[PDB]
UniProtKB/Swiss-Prot annotation:
GO terms for molecular function: ATP binding; ATP hydrolysis activity; ATP-dependent DNA (cytosine-5-)-methyltransferase activity; chromatin binding; DNA (cytosine-5-)-methyltransferase activity; sequence-specific DNA binding. It is an enzyme of class 3 (hydrolase). The keyword Hydrolase applies. Coiled coil: none annotated. The active site is at residue 139. ATP-dependent cytosine methylase that maintains DNA methylation by acting at hemimethylated palindromic 5'-CG-3' sites to produce symmetrically methylated DNA strands. DNA methylation may play a role in transcriptional silencing, particularly at transposable elements. Hemimethylated DNA substrates stimulate ATP hydrolysis and this is a prerequisite for methyltransferase activity. This is DNA (cytosine-5-)-methyltransferase DMT5. The lineage of its organism: Eukaryota, Fungi, Dikarya, Basidiomycota, Agaricomycotina.
Length: 1834
């Protein structure tokens, strides 16, 4: 066939091919002329050089070419990756991990010179000779081609014989060939399609071979292209063969970070431009306006079909989510059910860009800016799966912390390996000559044998030990022993699709008429009849082990000779089934015998799907233990031969399993019973479907399609009829009546359930539904009639009973003839048997035998941890084992496959016990690093400053890191029929690694190295951050007294003072904290994580108090200073130093004026004090001036001052511009490091130095009084200076994570952690990743840790906390509550009453604010919403209006000042919006009439009755008062439509008209645009109706509130025939309560209201309010009760209020002056809130007006007065801000009785929220309530 015809949809004759090795094997089998390259090399080594290739698809393909060439012709050709270039750090880390090029450069522009920088920073010379070169997508771009010309300088100089490019179709290719001809290179570009070379991806890219000119009269590129376009072979395997399974540890992890990321967390764009296009499409294809995949409301309110990765759908945008709906509807109406056909959408493209509904097996182009969507999974294409569509093989990949966008970059800007391999092989073949052969074979072969002979010894001597005890022989027949296992299986199997392969989902729900289990969170759109799940859950980790003990490992089949089958068919011939044919029988029996004979099935893995299953791989078949809940069994499947066409008669008949083994429930053994064969014998039978029952909307109708699928009916039952014998031959008695289960989803919502019948009593339930084939035309999909409905996987087949014809679908007909087909007849077989089967293994089982034989500089050797011996068959054996000598196996590139073929051995071994605890030699030699296990990272140089790196040290660091001992070593051999493989850990290497990462100190301590090994380690799915708890400080004895202070210590500061004394004393305590640096190494598949650690004990005196303002931290620290006085406990000293006995405090600037005044207030005069503010005090006093001083306190700005650093460098003997920086980053840290190295020498030399620096000399004590304030520049200052004891004081301790705890511990002196920049948050990583050298940013991606190595550091941080960190946080005081409740005055109460129902009418909750382009659509929003003024949401406005009456608070130009006078403005302004509505409705009708006439100028609609017009039918229906219109609402529509244009007829031109058409032209654009105008007009009609209905309601209630003759007259307008009466909240419909309760229940009042009404709306007219009762007119009733309460307090207390609304606070502050309660408002100034709070707390102003979110001590304050409940989103944040401020007043240090007051309104949303808070807060956290007592005071 032609290539285009073939690649449009996959050829059925090309064999299915998905293995990249088989791809390239076939490609080499194509051309046999490639050996000419072997010859023209003559023993040389080919020289490749890629540039910006991305993922080295070149080298992947070329390795596979070399392996293929050897496989066919027995000829070896080698090639040496001379150098690669790549710019992006994560890309080059990926390359270095997965390939290890010997040279890897930064940028191509540099490499036109004699040397360049490699990725590391080595600056090696450019190589100079290559043979083939490949540039890429990223370099071909005087600025545009900065890279392209830079690469051309390389090409011109070095003249490579072959050059290949790769890029998009739309590139300046002619200019490329011009630039090539500039330097004499023959170039020809051609475009080629990825789908044309073996892969079902669709990508077209443009290539061009190059070669130097004048090689011949021939033009080489033309012949090259002719050969390349010959190398075409279309796709034949669906993209479902390149996809990983859904429950796969790399995909389920991808689902889990999505859920976890959502668990941590607003950006609203308007898609109004494309919205009209979406509805236009829905209108055009006649699709409905439904949303059947995910019913989406807003950005993130959607709800998928429970199996659809819903946490991804929540994160998309509205356009994408809607386009998914439009796609599923287009794919519907074509007989195709999306979600059950395997296909893929790329939904980033706008609507109508693509035709869509393409060939299902194919996949669109996966551009870097893609948002793909796998249909049948319900989720995005995982990046690892986008890399396998580029031909890259993904098994042995190393990925370390890549995003999905960062990895989509790689997968999109890649080279399809088959395509580049074809281009290379044609290029090399055509340009085979002109190659500069070496042709010296034997001198090279000698070196080849030299390298092999030296490494064959090197691997054999790497293992020491093996004298450790061998352990008892294991037999593979561990069949050691009933249905308790089979029900442990049910209790352990999967219950929520989101569970995966080891997960527990709370609140499982199980259905009836079908057993579909799902979690309560992700379940309910395909909802169907649930009930909670009964059974309790066993962990699968615990189950699987009991299962493993039940299983053999190698099994074989005994029976099934030939000619036994030849009598198996005889009995079925005697029986009524019949044998259809003999050709198929021969072709089947043949391939069955070569699958059974000579095959030892080996155990591979266990599937934890909703049913547990075990899998056994052979050479030519597979075996599966199914372990069903009912009828567990074994099924055998035979692999069809690899070289078979897709439409093969053999391959087809070898698709379903071929043999069956019913596990005997009686028998306690797994393997037992008879074997039944599925003989291939297709059968023709005739059936009679009958449709009876109620008719239901069809599947398409339920989706809401509007074409011929507008309304279509299908039956609710189906009565199936089969012939007697034609029933008896089939095993299951399948004739009955099947009830449809529409809520129970399936393909086309088709789940029919068998009714319970007779004699099928104990048997699984049989379902009948539709199941598509994941590929192929709609007419492929059929009815399954099966016994299971589980969501299967690729390569798993459904065990079905009989299939039905493919032309049934659905209907509503009475009965019809249909053809059923069944093809597999099972027949008994007793001759089959399944049979299980001097092995050893050297478990060391002696943790000390290794430790004894361990020696220093033994890093070269691998201490043997395990050995084994197992009998294999040397025949039909595979090449992992090596005959004769140990072969090592490189784990990084072969470990997954290796350990996947050894699992049948590895899962009989016992777990390595005796190794969990760690013990080893002690007092080890310190600082003796290996410099082979742990190289010294190079010194980084600094010089607008760029982090430069030292090239010379970089090269040694490179070589050393390249040559490091692999911590685990695996070796295998097959000497004589007995395979022996061993595992060894390089323990001393781990210890040497951990030794290096532990910085040296001048300590008299010696570390101890140790090591441990833990089995069973499993990779960890994400959990949330661990919170860090601080221990209390009350359980200890209290220090007696300070014997100096004049004031007591309140009995809760004594218990902490004793704690500060005991540590600065440090009784006993050879060492306090043990700093532990661990290093690890993973052996994944076996599961061992072997970790070795170094411990250093350190003894340090001090801690962090971490206590909040209003606590006597200052008092307690002056106490600790007084106690240890004249007591010279600190022993050590630098040999040259100026140590004093003073103590130092570091405090911020505005808190320094405090501290000496508290010594003065307290004892004072018992020790000399010096405070220093400002630099010109350090100049003032010398060293002997500063002498004889006990306590010194410094402002933090002294370090931030730069004359301080000038003095520091002057005493450091540095140049005067050294240490002179304005940014204070990592560079200034080195400027400190060198200086501090200088200080020790300077002070070692040699007083009264006039201007000393604090950093030069040593203290008795340093106290960091605030640790979170100290800026990033001045923190480094306070981290250096030395002291005998270390104290940190802080109101807020920075204890949020490890990176925050480490900042404290560095001040302490501990070294609990090391930097890695892979542990912080995504935010925090960036602020440090801007300071990284370009090589460090690369080194971060190179190595990654285990998420257990972080948890252990978390544990060590917690252990640091529990020793050095205390916190005093438990009822201090009587905390009483006083719920004050309002009566509604109805002077402003009714003002409130109109708001909630006005907002109910307009149904607007919040003001949305987004990007509006349409000037006449955005203003209609800014005006409609304008009534909810000065606020964000309905709750906020309702609270503001229940606190105080006012239309709106931002505009103070007009002031109501009274309740009725405010109602006046309410009525006036609301009539104003009514007129605004009618006048927007004015201009809109005119524009509609004009656009209507725009059809008329063109002339009719091409027919008198071409179509009904939306606008026309809206007229003459909105133009009468007949029906579907308010009693009085619509009479005001005629007054506005007729005045423009009268009766329906004519009036084509408008009476005023400015622009007849805003308007290229389509004549359908304006048509459907007029339709949109009709819809908008209907909308506007609705708001008019609401506006007038609410107006009538409010004027009615204001009538009673006025209480006059009009009130009584319209009171007697009851209209209910009666004359106590309730009012409708929607309009004035005063009809009596007696009938009107039934009116509101029946949802229809007596009138011709107009809209349905709720019984909760009703109010009693006598219950509205009484007038003249209380003067609630001057201000809000809340404000006057506030005045009353604050009057009622005694004058001597203190009051604070919160004011949760700052807008309301402006009015509250003014109204408080009416009560004349002098107040502070906490505003009016910036940064002068310090004086705000110093006021009235130094001693005046009583009451404070807080903000409820705007560290200060409120100890003077006694009464909190909340003034209305706070409005907030989450209960967590509610309680956080609620216990906070409840904490601000009575935290500690208070000698009062705290009272909490609430001013709430009885009939108001404020109580509606208060009840919601109370009735839910007591359940969660079991929050402690406070006693409630009525405030009587004064
Ligand atoms: Zn779920
Ligand atoms: Zn159900
Ligand atoms: Zn070492
Ligand atoms: Zn009545
Ligand atoms: Zn009414």
């Amino acid at each position: 066939l032609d290539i285009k015809a073939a690649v449009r949809n996959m050829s059925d004759d090309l064999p299915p091919i998905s293995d990249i090795e088989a791809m390239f094997d076939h490609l080499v089998s194509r051309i046999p002329d490639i050996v000419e390259l072997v010859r023209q090399l003559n023993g040389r080594k080919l020289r490749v050089a890629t540039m910006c290739s991305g993922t080295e698809s070149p080298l992947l393909a070329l390795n596979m070419i070399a392996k293929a060439i050897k496989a066919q012709h027995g000829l070896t050709l080698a090639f040496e990756h001379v150098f690669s270039c790549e710019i992006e750090p994560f890309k080059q880390a990926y390359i270095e991990r997965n390939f290890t090029p010997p040279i890897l450069f930064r940028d191509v522009t540099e490499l036109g010179k004699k040397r360049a920088h490699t990725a590391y920073g080595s600056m090696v010379d450019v190589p100079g000779d290559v043979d083939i070169l490949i540039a890429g997508t990223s370099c071909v771009d005087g600025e545009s081609g900065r890279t392209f010309r830079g690469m051309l300088q390389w090409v011109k100089k070095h003249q490579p014989p072959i050059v290949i490019l790769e890029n998009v179709c739309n590139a300046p290719w002619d200019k490329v060939v011009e630039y090539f001809g500039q330097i004499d290179y023959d170039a020809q570009y051609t475009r080629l399609d990825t789908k044309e070379f073996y892969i079902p991806h669709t990508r077209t890219r443009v290539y061009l071979f190059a070669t130097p000119s004048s090689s011949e009269s021939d033009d080489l590129p033309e012949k090259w292209a002719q050969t390349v376009k010959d190398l075409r072979r279309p796709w034949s395997s669906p993209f479902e063969a390149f996809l990983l399974h859904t429950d796969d540890p790399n995909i389920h992890r991808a689902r889990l970070e999505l859920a976890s990321a959502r668990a941590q967390t607003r950006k609203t764009t308007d898609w109004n431009r494309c919205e009209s296009r979406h509805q236009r499409a829905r209108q055009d294809e006649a699709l409905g306006l439904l949303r059947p995949l995910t019913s989406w409301q807003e950005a993130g309110v959607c709800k998928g079909l429970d199996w659809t990765w819903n946490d991804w759908l929540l994160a998309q945008t509205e356009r994408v989510v809607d386009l998914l709906e439009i796609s599923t509807l287009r794919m519907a109406k074509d007989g195709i059910d999306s979600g059950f056909k395997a296909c893929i959408w790329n939904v980033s493209q706008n609507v109508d860009r693509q035709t869509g509904s393409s060939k299902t097996a194919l996949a669109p182009c996966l551009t870097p800016n893609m948002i793909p969507w796998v249909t049948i999974r319900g989720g995005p294409v995982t990046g690892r799966e986008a890399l396998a569509l580029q031909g890259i093989p993904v098994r042995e990949l190393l990925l370390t912390s890549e995003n999905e966008d960062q990895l989509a970059d790689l997968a999109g800007n890649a080279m399809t390996t088959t395509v580049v391999g074809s281009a290379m092989i044609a290029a090399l073949k055509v340009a085979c000559h002109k190659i500069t052969e070496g042709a010296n074979p034997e001198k090279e072969a000698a070196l080849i044998l030299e390298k092999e002979a030296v490494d064959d010894e090197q691997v054999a001597n790497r293992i020491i030990g093996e004298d450790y005890l061998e352990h008892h022989d294991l037999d593979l027949a561990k069949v050691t022993k009933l249905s308790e296992i089979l029900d442990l299986a049910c209790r352990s199997s999967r219950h929520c699709q989101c569970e995966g392969q080891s997960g527990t989902a709370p609140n499982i729900l199980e259905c009836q008429e079908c057993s579909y289990r799902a979690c309560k969170s992700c379940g309910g759109r395909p909802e169907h009849v649930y009930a909670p799940c009964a059974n309790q859950r066993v962990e699968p980790a615990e189950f699987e082990k009991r299962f493993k003990g039940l299983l053999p490992m190698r099994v074989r089949i005994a029976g099934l000779t030939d000619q036994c089958l030849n009598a198996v068919r005889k009995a079925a011939e005697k029986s009524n089934k019949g044998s259809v044919n003999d050709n198929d029988w021969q072709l089947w029996s043949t391939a069955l015998l070569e699958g059974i004979h000579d095959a030892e099935f080996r155990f591979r893995y266990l599937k934890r799907q909703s049913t547990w299953t075990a899998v056994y791989e052979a050479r030519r078949a597979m075996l599966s233990l199914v372990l069903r809940n009912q009828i567990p069994e074994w099924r055998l499947t035979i692999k069809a031969p690899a070289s078979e066409p897709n439409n093969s008669q053999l391959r087809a008949l070898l698709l379903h399993p071929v043999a069956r083994l019913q596990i005997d429930i009686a028998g306690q053994d797994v393997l037992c019973g008879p074997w039944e064969l599925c003989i291939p014998s297709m059968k023709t039978i005739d059936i009679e479907i009958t449709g009876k029952g109620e008719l239901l909307p069809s599947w398409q109708a339920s989706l809401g399609l509007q074409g011929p699928f507008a309304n279509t009916t299908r039956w609710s039952e189906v009565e199936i009829s089969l012939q007697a014998e034609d029933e008896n031959t089939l095993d299951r008695k399948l004739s009955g009546t099947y009830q449809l289960l529409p809520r129970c989803g399936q393909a086309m919502s088709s789940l029919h359930k068998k009714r319970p019948d007779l004699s099928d009593d104990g048997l699984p339930q049989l379902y009948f539904f539709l199941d598509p084939t994941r590929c192929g035309e709609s007419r492929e999909d059929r009815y399954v009639f099966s016994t299971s409905t589980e969501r299967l996987d690729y390569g798993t087949e459904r065990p079905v009973i009989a299939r039905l014809d493919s032309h049934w679908r659905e209907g509503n007909e009475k009965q019809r003839k249909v053809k059923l087909d069944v093809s597999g007849a099972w027949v008994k077989c007793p001759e089959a048997h399944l049979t299980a089967i001097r092995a050893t293994f050297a478990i060391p089982s002696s943790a000390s035998a290794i430790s004894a034989s361990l020696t220093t500089e033994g890093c070269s050797h691998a201490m043997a941890l395990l050995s084994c011996r197992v009998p294999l068959d040397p025949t039909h054996s595979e090449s992992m084992w090596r005959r004769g000598a140990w072969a090592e196996i490189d784990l990084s590139h072969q470990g997954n496959t290796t350990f996947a073929n050894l699992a049948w051995i590895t899962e009989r071994l016992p777990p390595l016990d005796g190794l969990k605890n760690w013990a080893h030699i002690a007092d080890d030699v310190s600082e003796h690093v290996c410099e082979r296990c742990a190289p010294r990272p190079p010194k980084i140089h600094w010089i607008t400053i760029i982090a430069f790196e030292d090239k010379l040290e970089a090269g040694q660091y490179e070589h050393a890191l390249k040559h490091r001992p692999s911590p685990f070593v695996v070796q295998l051999r097959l000497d004589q029929d007995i395979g022996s493989f061993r595992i060894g850990l390089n323990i001393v290497s781990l210890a040497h690694r951990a030794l290096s990462r532990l910085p040296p100190t001048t300590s008299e301590h010696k570390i101890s190295l140790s090591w441990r090994l833990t089995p069973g380690h499993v990779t960890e799915s994400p959990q949330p951050r661990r919170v860090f708890i601080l221990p209390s400080n009350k359980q200890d004895p209290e220090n007696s007294q300070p014997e100096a202070f004049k004031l007591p210590l309140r009995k809760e500061q004594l218990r902490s003072l004793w704690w500060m004394l005991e540590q600065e004393k440090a009784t006993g305590k050879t060492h306090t904290f043990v700093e532990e640096e661990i290093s690890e190494s993973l052996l994944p598949a076996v599961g061992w994580r072997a970790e070795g650690k170094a411990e250093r004990p350190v003894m340090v005196r001090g801690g962090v108090i971490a206590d909040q303002v209003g606590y006597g931290k200052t008092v307690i620290s002056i106490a600790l200073v007084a106690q240890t006085l004249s007591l010279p406990a600190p022993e050590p000293a630098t040999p040259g130093l100026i140590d004093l006995k003073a103590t130092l405090i570091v405090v911020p600037g505005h808190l320094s004026k405090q501290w000496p005044n508290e010594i003065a207030r307290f004892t004072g005069s018992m020790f000399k004090v010096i405070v220093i503010q400002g630099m010109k005090d350090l100049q003032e006093k010398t060293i002997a001036e500063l002498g004889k001083a006990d306590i010194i306190v410094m402002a933090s700005e002294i370090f931030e001052s730069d004359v301080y650093w000038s003095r520091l460098e002057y005493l450091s003997a540095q140049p005067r511009e050294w240490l002179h920086d304005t940014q204070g980053g990592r560079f200034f840290c080195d400027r400190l490091d060198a200086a501090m190295e200088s200080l020790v020498s300077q002070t070692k030399i040699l007083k009264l130095l006039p201007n000393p620096v604090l950093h030069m000399f040593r203290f008795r004590r340093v106290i960091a009084d605030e640790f979170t304030y100290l800026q990033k520049k001045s923190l480094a200052a306070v981290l250096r200076l030395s002291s005998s004891y270390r104290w940190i004081l802080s109101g807020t301790p920075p204890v949020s994570d490890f990176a925050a705890i480490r900042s404290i511990a560095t001040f302490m002196g501990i070294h609990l952690g090391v930097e890695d920049d892979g542990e912080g948050d995504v935010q925090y990583q960036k602020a440090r990743a801007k300071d990284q050298t370009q090589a460090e940013k690369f080194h971060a991606f190179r190595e990654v840790h285990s998420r257990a190595w972080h948890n252990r550091r978390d544990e060590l941080a917690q252990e640091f906390l529990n020793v050095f960190v205390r916190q005093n946080i438990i009822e201090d005081i009587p905390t009483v509550e006083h719920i004050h409740t309002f009566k509604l005055p109805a002077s402003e109460g009714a003002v409130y009453l109109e708001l909630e129902h006005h907002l109910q009418a307009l149904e607007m909750q919040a003001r949305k604010e987004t990007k509006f382009k349409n000037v006449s659509q955005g203003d209609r929003n800014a005006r409609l919403e304008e009534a909810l003024s000065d606020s964000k949401t309905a709750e906020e406005a309702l609270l503001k209006r229940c606190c105080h009456f006012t239309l709106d608070l931002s505009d103070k130009t007009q002031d109501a000042k009274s309740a009725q006078e405010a109602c006046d403005h309410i009525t006036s302004a609301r009539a104003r919006q009514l007129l605004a509505c009618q006048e927007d409705l004015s201009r809109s009708v005119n524009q509609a009439i004009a656009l209507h006439g725009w059809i008329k100028k063109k002339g009719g609609f091409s027919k008198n009755d071409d179509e009904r017009q939306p606008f026309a039918e809206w007229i003459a229906f909105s133009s009468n008062i007949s029906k579907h219109q308010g009693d009085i609402e619509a009479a005001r529509i005629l007054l506005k439509v007729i005045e423009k244009c009268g009766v329906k007829d004519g009036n084509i031109p408008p009476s005023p008209s400015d622009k007849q058409s805003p308007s290229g032209a389509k004549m359908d654009d304006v048509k459907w645009q007029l339709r949109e105008q009709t819809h908008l007009l209907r909308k506007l009609v609705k708001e008019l109706v609401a506006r007038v209905r609410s107006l009538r309601f409010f004027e009615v209630v204001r009538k009673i509130q006025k209480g006059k003759s009009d009130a009584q007259i319209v009171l007697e307008s009851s209209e209910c025939g009666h004359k106590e009466m309730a009012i409708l909240s929607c309009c004035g419909h005063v009809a009596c309560h007696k009938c009107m309760r039934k009116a509101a229940a029946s949802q229809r009042c007596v009138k011709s209201c107009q809209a349905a009404v709720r019984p909760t709306n009703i109010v009693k007219v006598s219950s509205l309010g009484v007038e003249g009762e209380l003067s609630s007119g001057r201000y809000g009733a809340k404000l006057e009760h506030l005045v009353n309460l604050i009057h009622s307090i005694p004058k001597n207390e203190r009051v604070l209020v919160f004011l949760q609304w700052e807008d309301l606070a402006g009015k509250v502050s003014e109204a408080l002056s009416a009560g004349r309660i002098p107040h502070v408002t906490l505003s009016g100034s910036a940064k002068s809130r310090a004086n705000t709070l110093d006021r009235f707390q130094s001693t005046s102003a009583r009451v404070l007006l807080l903000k409820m979110n705007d560290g200060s001590n409120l100890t003077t304050a006694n009464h909190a007065v909340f003034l209305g409940p706070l409005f907030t989103n989450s209960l967590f944040n509610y309680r956080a801000v609620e216990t906070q401020a409840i904490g601000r007043v009575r935290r500690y240090g208070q000698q009062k009785k705290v009272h909490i007051h609430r001013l709430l309104a009885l009939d108001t949303i404020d109580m509606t929220i208060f009840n919601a808070r109370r009735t839910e807060l007591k359940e969660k956290t079991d929050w402690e309530e406070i006693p409630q007592e009525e405030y009587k005071g004064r």
